[PDB]
Structure formats: structure tokens, C-alpha cells
Amino acid sequence: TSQVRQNYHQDSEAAINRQINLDLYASYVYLSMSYYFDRDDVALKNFAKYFLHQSHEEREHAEKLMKLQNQRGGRIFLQDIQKPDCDDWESGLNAMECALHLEKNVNQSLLELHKLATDKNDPHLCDFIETHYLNEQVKAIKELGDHVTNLRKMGAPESGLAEYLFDKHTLG
Amino acid sequence: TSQVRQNYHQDSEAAINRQINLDLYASYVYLSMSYYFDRDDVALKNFAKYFLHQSHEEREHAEKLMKLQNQRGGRIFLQDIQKPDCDDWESGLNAMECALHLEKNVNQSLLELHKLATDKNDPHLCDFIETHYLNEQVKAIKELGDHVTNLRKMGAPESGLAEYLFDKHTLG
Amino acid sequence: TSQVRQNYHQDSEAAINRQINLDLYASYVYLSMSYYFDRDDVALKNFAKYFLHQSHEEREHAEKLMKLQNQRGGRIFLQDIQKPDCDDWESGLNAMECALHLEKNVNQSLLELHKLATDKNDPHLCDFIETHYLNEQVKAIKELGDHVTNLRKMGAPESGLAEYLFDKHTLG
Amino acid sequence: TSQVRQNYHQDSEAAINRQINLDLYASYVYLSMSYYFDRDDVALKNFAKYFLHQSHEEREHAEKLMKLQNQRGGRIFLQDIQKPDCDDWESGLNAMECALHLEKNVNQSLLELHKLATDKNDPHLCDFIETHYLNEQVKAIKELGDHVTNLRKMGAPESGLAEYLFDKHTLG
Amino acid sequence: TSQVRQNYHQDSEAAINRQINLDLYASYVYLSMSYYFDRDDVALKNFAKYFLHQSHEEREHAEKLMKLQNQRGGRIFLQDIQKPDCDDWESGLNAMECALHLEKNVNQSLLELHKLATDKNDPHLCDFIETHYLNEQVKAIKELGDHVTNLRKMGAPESGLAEYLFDKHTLG
Amino acid sequence: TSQVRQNYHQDSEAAINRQINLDLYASYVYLSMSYYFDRDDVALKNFAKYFLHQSHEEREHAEKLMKLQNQRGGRIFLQDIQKPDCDDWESGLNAMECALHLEKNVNQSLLELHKLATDKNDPHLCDFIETHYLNEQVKAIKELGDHVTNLRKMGAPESGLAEYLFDKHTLG
Ligand SMILES: [Zn+2]
Ligand SMILES: [Zn+2]
Ligand SMILES: [Zn+2]
Ligand SMILES: [Zn+2]
Ligand SMILES: [Zn+2]
Ligand SMILES: [Zn+2]
Ligand SMILES: [Zn+2]
Ligand SMILES: [Zn+2]
Ligand SMILES: [Zn+2]
Ligand SMILES: [Zn+2]
Ligand SMILES: [Zn+2]
Ligand SMILES: [Zn+2]
Ligand SMILES: [Zn+2]
Ligand SMILES: [Zn+2]
Ligand SMILES: [Zn+2]
Ligand SMILES: [Zn+2]
Ligand SMILES: [Zn+2]
Ligand SMILES: [Zn+2]
Ligand SMILES: [Zn+2]
Ligand SMILES: [Zn+2]
Ligand SMILES: [Zn+2]
Ligand SMILES: [Zn+2]
Ligand SMILES: [Zn+2]
Ligand SMILES: [Zn+2]
Ligand SMILES: [Zn+2]
Ligand SMILES: [Zn+2]
Ligand SMILES: [Zn+2]
Ligand SMILES: [Zn+2]
Ligand SMILES: [Zn+2]
Ligand SMILES: [Zn+2]
Ligand SMILES: [Zn+2]
Ligand SMILES: [Zn+2]
Ligand SMILES: [Zn+2]
Ligand SMILES: [Zn+2]
Ligand SMILES: [Zn+2]
Ligand SMILES: [Zn+2]
Ligand SMILES: [Zn+2]
Ligand SMILES: [Zn+2]
Ligand SMILES: [Zn+2]
Ligand SMILES: [Zn+2]
Ligand SMILES: [Zn+2]
Ligand SMILES: [Zn+2]
Ligand SMILES: [Zn+2]
Ligand SMILES: [Zn+2]
Ligand SMILES: [Zn+2]
């Protein structure tokens, strides 16, 4: 037992390790999406930049969880980072829809982690998740929904003109 | 076949995808090492910072290869990022020795990629590897060897004083 | 034989003179394209500016080869600069497609020059072509492919609206 | 007929296309002269710089004529740019004498173009040639004559010392 | 075997030690030339400054090779630096001709080193020689040829006036 | 006899040539020491920097003697620069001890040169040696003795920790 450990349940420690993996996975999904938009036969540079930014942000989410694990005297155990479900992301709209789905899955995991913190009476962990994770998820989900709505209303994915103009006027 | 593709062999394309995975793997190894040094029972903050910096650099190596793949009209295929061989890295000296081994393995992969480029008469690929990868590897290997030598000569790993002072006076 | 000449094969000297002509030819193609877009019945000012910039760049490519010829003690022999294959370039998309074809032809010539340098064991010439020419070609081909893809996806050449908006939002 | 065309005779349009070619030709002559002075066995760097400057200026003359053609609703038709009459320009004095001859030939062409403009009662074209071309020619011819006179009086071409000192003290 | 050594042939290591000596030798030749021009009975201060600058540059060439040897895990073995072939360099022209000969000999050694790197499939060494040495040699040879040509054309070595004026107007 | 020569004995001239060689030799010894500390299996970067600085300084000592020779109308005669007695310098302490020995040998040579100047009633030479050489030697010897004392008292050469800490805290 770490000299620093206090009020930190083994189940919470294990859940934090699962969430570290999930955020690394999310970073990898967005990395794949980014470079899909960098292909010469897709060529939407601002979709590419947008998803690369999200990829680096997810990696920061994972590092802050790793820091948390050590702060509480837990021990980090890393697992393989699974490759994303898709190699080809089809369209800007489809990538946005996939990102929305991903963020809702990450949110569900964080809400389950918060419930575990509650159940184990770990207010420091509750506060950590609330302060640093839950509103980030709500903001991300709202932003992605807004993007999906605009792309659909503009006529994507069939209108390549729509995705081109959204790339310039929203993601620019 | 991509409209941009020219003088780019399928074997080279496949090798670039393997190297993307290897550099992501290297980023993950260094991430794990970094947070080992952040543990309360290790507590070498400059070893932690040094390995986090290397982790972010390896991720940049991988992104530049992804950019290359698309520049040449190849198609990126991502694979799982395997977890590192160790969860516990033992000591600053041991982590440095492991990093040296890793960088020599990465170098061997890059040298094999260069040989493939030569064999397929792909001077653009040869130049890319020479310019952006081979001297970075030689510099990294030299730096890690220098670190290993100093730590050994100072009395690491047995002298916790040695690793403490190296953390301050070399990695600070 | 020039007092400076060393390890410079007569075939390499002749190939450099052919490449000087090819780069001057490329400058002329882009000059013609530029002023096509300046016509009152075409009137795409940013396509015009884009191709004029490429024209001046090709002229710089040719001058640097002329400098190289003299650096190595070869003798420059100029040939006529042939007029481009087209007087009327049809559309922004068609001009981009023509430019892509041209750059791939220039690239093929440079790759053949590099192979000659290899065959004659002229590492200075190999380095000159790799450093100053081959990645410029790869970047140019990628950029033109990206432009072609966007114009096609926006609905060019039939949509004059597409070419108008690309002129403003990409080439502006 | 272009929507912009007004008072622009077909003969004037054809003459402007001939003059575009002549100015491109002049740019090529000066490019060849420039790099002759860059040879290791000639090695007069300021003669080289002087003629490269004139080469770029002639290209600007040609571009302004191309702009004029489109302004008036004429259609640009490019022709091959013939290689210069000489590969070896002999001496600084000889190159200057050749340049003087060239500029007087260009001037004769411009004076014939002005006469055509007069004959077709095209005052806009008359003004264009007078304002942008005729005094440039008179200044260029005077400058080249001055250079020829100095080089002759200093003892060129036989005195390599003369050409060396003129390169430093006049063209520097 | 050094912990850093990888893909570094013993023949390459030995060749790098020979080249270190050759560059030190070149530094010594130029040091001797410099102070010849500082003699009261020669008294060409800018020839003296020019050759002292080249002497210090050759020493930097040698130090960068020493750095390379250690980077690759080779071991530096120094040899005597032989005195130059001449004590008296005769004239500015003769010194320039001697320097041209020296630089072509150094170039031949570097080209042989590059060929060895190729033969031993050492792309890092190939890149090192190409990037840091081969174009420096081509530039140096071209500059010295240009100087020789000017001095000859001005009437050196018989014209002390020529060497005086070149010292002021070229080397100043 | 040089037009400038006055009160300058042939023996003094010969002694100045011997001292030029000795200072070049000293520059070479320190160059060798510097790069020994740059080896991956030694890796003391501040010892390396310290000895490289001394190497460049000795070269300046030699150049100032060459200037002196010409100032007085003597003639410089260069000799081979002998390779140092050691390839491997063993330790920081051993290198410092070797440097101390070298500087005392250089000092003995300078004191003998001063005695010769006295014997030949050459006060300009006496002043040159006193002003520019003798106190530099006394300062260098004192500094090296101080370094030797500290390294010995810290426990070098057996304590690699000692040499590491001296590298940081004294030579940093
Ligand atoms: Zn963000
Ligand atoms: Zn996240
Ligand atoms: Zn980070
Ligand atoms: Zn898997
Ligand atoms: Zn997220
Ligand atoms: Zn709470
Ligand atoms: Zn709560
Ligand atoms: Zn709160
Ligand atoms: Zn770094
Ligand atoms: Zn890497
Ligand atoms: Zn990045
Ligand atoms: Zn696994
Ligand atoms: Zn690495
Ligand atoms: Zn290559
Ligand atoms: Zn190669
Ligand atoms: Zn450009
Ligand atoms: Zn080009
Ligand atoms: Zn130019
Ligand atoms: Zn033709
Ligand atoms: Zn091009
Ligand atoms: Zn090469
Ligand atoms: Zn090559
Ligand atoms: Zn290169
Ligand atoms: Zn001008
Ligand atoms: Zn003109
Ligand atoms: Zn222009
Ligand atoms: Zn012709
Ligand atoms: Zn003109
Ligand atoms: Zn008028
Ligand atoms: Zn008129
Ligand atoms: Zn220089
Ligand atoms: Zn050199
Ligand atoms: Zn140096
Ligand atoms: Zn000898
Ligand atoms: Zn050199
Ligand atoms: Zn190579
Ligand atoms: Zn090579
Ligand atoms: Zn000093
Ligand atoms: Zn000294
Ligand atoms: Zn100096
Ligand atoms: Zn010897
Ligand atoms: Zn000394
Ligand atoms: Zn005295
Ligand atoms: Zn005295
Ligand atoms: Zn300290």
C-alpha cells in the first residue's frame, strides 16, 4: 500500500486504469480521422486540423488521469490501444457522427466512474471527475451535435460543396 | 491508384505503415516510463519530464510518417498499439538502458526501410528517411548512451543519491 | 575541361541541360494558364495569381539548375522553349488537371536524372536533386491533387459557382 | 468578339502577340548572357547580376503586354521562345554590344507597333506604348551605349583588367 | 564494441580517422598561406585574412568529423599533421592555384568516403557526407576557380598591380 | 635580410619557430583530450568544452607568434605537428594532470626563449614574451593545479561521482 493512499478503493483504481485506456483510444480514433481528411482524394484541411486538435486533447485527458492515479497512490497498468473500427471515415458528416457517438460512449464511462466514486464515498474522485471531465464531455457532445446538424442542413454528405463550405466557414 | 502516386512501391507503403505503428509504440513506452517516475515511491520529476518529452516527440515522428504516406498517395492502415513490456521500470538507469534498446530497435527498422527504398529506386523516400529520421536516431542513441554511462559511473542503480543528483544536474 | 570539373559525367551534364529546358517549359505553361484566367470571359483572379506564382517558381528552378551546371564545370546549352499544348485551358478544374500532369512529367524527368546520378556515382548530384527538387515535386503534386479533388467534389467544371467559390476560399 | 472590345484592330492584336514573343525572347537572351558571366572561366559576378536583372525586367515587359491584350479583349497566342543566337558571349564588351543591338531591335518593333496604332486610330494603344515602352527603350539604349563606350575606352576586350575593374566600379 | 554502435563498419571508422587528418592538414596549409601574405615583402592583407578564414573553417570540418566518430561509437585515432609542401607560396595566384588543387584532393577523399558508405550500406554516413561536406567542396572549388580566372585575366602573377587590386576589390 | 629586420638574432628567429610548433602541438593535445570526454563511454561534456576552449586558445598563441615572426622580419618555417602521446586519457583527473605537465613544459620553453632574448639584448622580444606569454602560463598552471587538487580531494579518479560533480559545479 502506497504511503499516500487514503480512501481510495481498489475498484476506483481499476476504473481509472480503464478510463486511461479509453481516452488513449479516443486519441487514436481522432488521429485516424484527422489523416483521412489529409488524403488527396478527401482534401478537407480544416476537418483534418479539427480532428488532430481533438486527438491531442484526448491524450491530455489520459495524462491527467495517469497523474490522478499516482496522486492517490494507485498504480498505473496500461493496456493495448485498440485500432479504430474504421480505416475509411466516408465523409465529414460521417466522421462527425462517429465522433459524437464516441464522445457519448466516453461520457457514459465517466458517469459510471462518478457513480462508483459516490458508492465508495470518494468525494475527491467525485470532484475530480465533475471538475475536469463531465462538463468537457457535455461541451464536446453539444459542439459535435451542432456540427452534425449544420452539415445535414447544408446537404452533406451528398453535397461535396456543403462539406467544402463548412470546412472553410465553420472549421476554418 | 491515387492520382498523386508515382514511383511508390506497395512494399514501401506497407513498410511506412509498420513504421507508423513502431513510432506510436515508442511514444507509449516513453509515456509509461514517464509516469513511473511520477510515482510517490520513485519521485524523480526530471526523469518524468524527460520521458514525457520523448513520448510527445515519438508521436510527432508517427504523424510525419502519416503525412508522408498521404503525400505519396499511399493509404494509412493503423494497427493496435501494443502495451510496453514492463509496468515497473525499476530505476532511472534501467529506464535509460531500456530506452537505448528501444531506440536501437527503431533505428534498425528505419535502416531496413531505407534499404527497401534503395532497392525500389525511391530516392524521395531515401531522402525522407535520411533527412528526418536517421540522424535523429543517431543523436538519440548517443544521448541515451551518455546518460547510461554517467548513471553507471555515479553508482546507479544502487545509489539512490546518484539517481537523485543526475535528475537535478543533468535532466533539470 | 573546366578547372573545377570533378566526378561530373558528360551524360549528367547533358541531362542537366534537358532539365533546364523542361523547367523553363513548365514556367511557360503556367504563364499561359495565368493569363487565361485574366481573360474578361474567364475572370478568376486568384487562379490567375496562383498560376503566375507557379510560373515564376519554375523559372527559379531553371536558374538554380543553370547555377549547378556552372558549379560543376559543365556548359549550359539552351534550347527553344516550346509553346504550351493549349491556348485555351477550358476551366479552373481542367487547368489544375493539366498542371498535375505537367508536375508528374517533371517529376519523372527528375527521377530519371537521379537514377543517372546514381549510375555514374555522383553523390553531389544525387544530393542536389533530392534536396532541392524531389520533395518540391511531391509537395506540388499533392497540392494539385488536393485542388482537383475539391473542385470535382464542389461540382466543377459545370458549376461556375464552384470555380468562383474555390477561387475565393482556397486560392484567395 | 469580346464584350470589352472597342476600337481594337485585329492587326494591333496580332502585333501585340508578336511583341509579347519578342520581349520573352529578350528575357531569354539576357538569361543566357547572365549565366555565361557565372562560368568559372569568365567569373564576372556583377556582369552576371546586371544581365539577370535585365532578364527579369524583360519578362515583366512581356507580362504587361499580356495584361494589355486581355484589357482590350484581344486573345493571347504564344509562340515558341527561340534560343539566343550565341551560347558563348565572348567578353563583357561583346555582351554589352549584343545587348545594345537587341534593344535597338526591340525599339524598332515598338516604333512599328506605335505606327500601326496611329494608322488604326487607336490612341489608347499609342499611349500605352509611349508611356510604358518607348522611354524605357531610349534609357536602356543610352545606358548600354555608355557601358560600351567605357569598356572600349578602358581597353576591353583585350584587357581582362578593364573588364574586371568595370565589373567592380560600374556594375557593382 | 561501443553501446551506441550500430551499422558502422570498421572500414568506415578508419576512413573517418583519415579524413579527420586530411582536414587538419588542410587547416595547416591555409595557416601557412595566410602568414605568407602577412610577410613585409608580400604584404597582401586581404589574401592573408581570406586564407586564415579558410584555415579556421577546415579545423571546424575536422571537429565535426571527430564529433561524428563519437556519435557512431567509433574511436578517434589522431596522426601527425604533416607540414605543407611549400614554405614560400610565390604569389597570390599561385596560392589560389594550390588551394584549388588542395580542395579537389579533399573532394576526392570525400567522394571515396561516400562510395565506402554506399558499399557498406551506411545511409547515415552517406547523408552526413552529402549534407555537410560535398556541396561545401563544390562551392569552395568554384570560388577558387573564379579567383584563379580573375587573377590570370588581370595579369597576375607578373602584375603586382593586379594582385594588389584583386586583394582590395575581391578579397576586401 | 628583410627591410624591417633590426636587432633580431638568427637564434631568436629559430627559437620563435620552435615555439610556434610547441603551441600548435599544445592545441592538438587539448583537441584530443576534448573529444575523449565526448566519447559515449566517458560523457563529461564540460570537461570536453573546457579542453576545446584551451585547444582554440593555444592555436591563438601560435598565430600571435607567427605574427611576431613577420613583425620582426624573420621567416616562418613550419614543422609537422606531432600526434599527442596518448589516445585514451583515462579520466578527468588524469587529463588535468597531463595538461598541468604540458603547461609546465610550455612554460619552460618560454622561459628559455626569454633567456635567449636577454642574452641577445632583444628587449622587444623580452617584452613580447613577458607581456603576452609568461603570466598566461602562470595563470594556466595555477588553474590546472587547483583543478587537480579539487578532483583528488573529491575522490577522483575512482569516484565517477566526483568527476561528474566537478564537471557540473566547476567546469559548468
Ligand atoms: Zn479543444
Ligand atoms: Zn477524453
Ligand atoms: Zn502531454
Ligand atoms: Zn486488436
Ligand atoms: Zn473526448
Ligand atoms: Zn461530490
Ligand atoms: Zn459526486
Ligand atoms: Zn465542484
Ligand atoms: Zn527532443
Ligand atoms: Zn521515433
Ligand atoms: Zn501532433
Ligand atoms: Zn497485446
Ligand atoms: Zn525515438
Ligand atoms: Zn538517396
Ligand atoms: Zn539512400
Ligand atoms: Zn510556391
Ligand atoms: Zn520545376
Ligand atoms: Zn531569377
Ligand atoms: Zn515549336
Ligand atoms: Zn513544378
Ligand atoms: Zn546520395
Ligand atoms: Zn541518390
Ligand atoms: Zn540529403
Ligand atoms: Zn532595371
Ligand atoms: Zn523589353
Ligand atoms: Zn511577373
Ligand atoms: Zn529554334
Ligand atoms: Zn529591353
Ligand atoms: Zn497618341
Ligand atoms: Zn501616338
Ligand atoms: Zn567560409
Ligand atoms: Zn575541409
Ligand atoms: Zn572549434
Ligand atoms: Zn613530416
Ligand atoms: Zn576545404
Ligand atoms: Zn544516401
Ligand atoms: Zn549516398
Ligand atoms: Zn581561456
Ligand atoms: Zn600556449
Ligand atoms: Zn585564429
Ligand atoms: Zn610522428
Ligand atoms: Zn597553454
Ligand atoms: Zn626586458
Ligand atoms: Zn627580459
Ligand atoms: Zn549540486
UniProtKB/Swiss-Prot annotation, chains A, B, C, D, E, F:
Domain Ferritin-like diiron: 6-155
GO cellular component, as recorded: autolysosome; autophagosome; cytoplasm; cytosol; extracellular exosome; extracellular region; ferritin complex; ficolin-1-rich granule lumen
UniProt binding sites for Fe cation 2: E58, E103, Q137
Xref: Pfam families: Ferritin
Any one GO biological process: immune response
InterPro entries: Ferritin (IPR001519), Ferritin-like (IPR012347), Ferritin-like_diiron (IPR009040), Ferritin-like_SF (IPR009078), Ferritin_CS (IPR014034), Ferritin_DPS_dom (IPR008331)
Protein localization: Cytoplasm; Lysosome; Cytoplasmic vesicle, Autophagosome
Tissue expression from the record: Expressed in the liver.
Stored Gene3D superfamilies: 1.20.1260.10
Binding site for Fe cation 1: D23, E58, H61
Keyword field: Acetylation, Cytoplasm, Cytoplasmic vesicle, Iron, Iron storage, Lysosome, Metal-binding, Neurodegeneration, Oxidoreductase, Phosphoprotein
Enzyme class at the top of the EC tree: oxidoreductase
Similarity field: Belongs to the ferritin family.
Disease affiliated with this protein: Hemochromatosis 5: A disorder of iron metabolism characterized by iron overload. Excess iron is deposited in a variety of organs leading to their failure, and resulting in serious illnesses including cirrhosis, hepatomas, diabetes, cardiomyopathy, arthritis, and hypogonadotropic hypogonadism. Severe effects of the disease usually do not appear until after decades of progressive iron loading.
Summary of the function given for this chain in its UniProt record: Stores iron in a soluble, non-toxic, readily available form. Important for iron homeostasis. Has ferroxidase activity. Iron is taken up in the ferrous form and deposited as ferric hydroxides after oxidation. Also plays a role in delivery of iron to cells. Mediates iron uptake in capsule cells of the developing kidney. Delivery to lysosomes is mediated by the cargo receptor NCOA4 for autophagic degradation and release of iron.
Subunit record text: Oligomer of 24 subunits. There are two types of subunits: L (light) chain and H (heavy) chain. The major chain can be light or heavy, depending on the species and tissue type. In the human liver, the heavy chain is predominant. The functional molecule forms a roughly spherical shell with a diameter of 12 nm and contains a central cavity into which the insoluble mineral iron core is deposited. Interacts with NCOA4; NCOA4 promotes targeting of the iron-binding ferritin complex to autolysosomes following starvation or iron depletion.
Record-given protein name: Ferritin heavy chain
Native source organism of the sequence: Homo sapiens
Gene it is expressed from: FTH1
